[PDB]
Design a protein around this ligand. Structure first.
Ligand SMILES: *[C@@H]1O[C@H](CO)[C@@H](O)[C@H](O)[C@H]1NC(C)=O
Lengths: 106, 122, 194
């Protein structure tokens, strides 16, 4: 059983701003963290896998970094399509998701 | 392109029998794990079980070992989730995901179905 | 009678590679054809003796040693091959007569959340001479500073735990491996085919 935490739970900025999302792990997960984007009432879409690899078709603004137990999601420039909620799901031992972080306009 | 399509939402009485399906197309149904994920209201995403068609290998969580049943029909390429007897705590959003397998890992939930709300009430 | 291959292949418990289980089979009649024509085995590679030519040719006694490895590490169970498993855990001699039967056991030996029962040795100071096992778990010294037995800097735990899951890569599924080995001595041929 592995529990993950996201900080901050809620964070709002304007278009073009730099958004940093931190996912912290209970124990060591190496680099088996994947980042999802979920629109309200829609299936989540994978953005980053292996904690640093971009998925095909995702804009290059999203970036993944970190290893061990400290992970970071960085949005280079916020844009109207970036407004959604984000989950950091680990898959080292058994699939487990974070509580999620919701972003919106300011 | 991989497409997963599920059925519409159901509203059932407790104690009944419910079967919810998820149709998979765009890939070879016999060589990819498909997992069921449940998101109860007020709780985060949480898997229930996995099923690999071709080997007929079905594995559930320890807590839900004898309450839900996963099944597959490769002739039509659908994955079924059925309840022996619906309870009051089974109301949630149910997802079917095709696991993209990576080495030394539990696999990545890559493609998701549109989801299906299930509500239990009297 | 019949040679008891049932309790070595269909056994419910397989030992790890650092403690590979050895069974001496002798004084019975060999039925290797069932081994070859089962078609349920992923890999069945035989050196020295052809699979279709071992049915009649017979020996004095055979050793079946079984363990569980990774899927991508089954290429290392062969003479003159390197790697972690083939150097620190299980090394076959270049002049090898037995052969390797490895079949996938993803539905048995892998459990969701991590099956950490199976271990393999990762670090040791000397290579393995053919056909022996080392079980000693003393913390070896990586550097020149003595660790006095206790674990710490420049002294690591030799054993490492396999994490087996049903959703691992096809090259990382837990493969159950049995190795057959034959020897020639002055003893009469106890084990022979039909
Ligand atoms: C036991 O192992 C043999 C191979 O030696 C196999 O042919 C047989 O089917 C196994 N038993 C069962 C019940 O499958």
């Amino acid at each position: 059983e592995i529990v993950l935490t996201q900080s901050p739970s809620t964070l709002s900025a304007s278009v073009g701003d730099r958004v940093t999302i931190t996912c912290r792990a209970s124990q060591n997960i190496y680099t088996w963290l994947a980042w999802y984007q979920r629109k309200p009432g829609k299936a989540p879409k994978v953005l980053i896998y292996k904690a640093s690899s971009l998925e095909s078709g995702v804009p290059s603004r999203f970036s993944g970094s970190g290893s061990g137990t400290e992970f970071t999601l960085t949005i280079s420039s916020l844009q109207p399509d970036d407004f959604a909620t984000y989950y950091c799901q680990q898959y080292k031992s058994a699939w487990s998701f974070g509580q999620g972080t919701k972003v919106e306009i300011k | 392109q991989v497409q997963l399509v599920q059925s519409g939402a159901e509203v059932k009485k407790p104690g009944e029998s419910l079967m919810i399906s998820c149709k998979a197309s765009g890939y070879n149904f016999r060589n990819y794990w498909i997992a069921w994920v449940r998101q109860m209201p007020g709780k985060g995403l949480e898997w229930m079980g996995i099923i690999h068609p071709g080997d007929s290998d079905i594995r559930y969580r320890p807590s839900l070992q004898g309450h839900v049943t996963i099944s597959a029909d490769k002739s039509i390429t659908t994955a079924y989730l059925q309840w022996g007897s619906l309870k009051a705590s089974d109301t949630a959003m149910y997802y079917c995901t095709r696991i993209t397998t990576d080495a030394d890992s539990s696999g990545l939930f890559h493609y998701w179905g549109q989801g299906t709300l299930v509500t239990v009430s009297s | 009678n019949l040679c008891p291959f049932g309790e070595v292949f269909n056994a419910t418990r397989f030992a790890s590679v650092y403690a590979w289980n050895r069974k001496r089979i002798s004084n019975c009649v060999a039925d290797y054809s069932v081994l070859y024509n089962s078609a349920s085995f992923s890999t069945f590679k035989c050196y020295g003796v052809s699979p279709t030519k071992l049915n009649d040719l017979c020996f004095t006694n055979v050793y079946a040693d079984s363990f569980v490895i990774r899927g991508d590490e089954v290429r290392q169970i062969a003479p003159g091959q390197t790697g972690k498993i083939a150097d620190y855990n299980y090394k076959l001699p270049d002049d090898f007569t037995g052969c390797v039967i490895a079949w996938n056991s993803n539905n048995l030996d892998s459990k969701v959340g991590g099956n950490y029962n199976y271990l393999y040795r990762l670090f040791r100071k000397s290579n393995l001479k053919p056909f022996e096992r080392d079980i000693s778990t003393e913390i070896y010294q990586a550097g020149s500073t003595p660790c006095n037995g206790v674990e710490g800097f420049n002294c690591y735990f030799p054993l490492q735990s396999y994490g087996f899951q049903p959703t691992n890569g096809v090259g990382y599924q837990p493969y159950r491996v049995v190795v057959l080995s034959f020897e020639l001595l002055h003893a009469p041929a106890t084990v022979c085919g039909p």
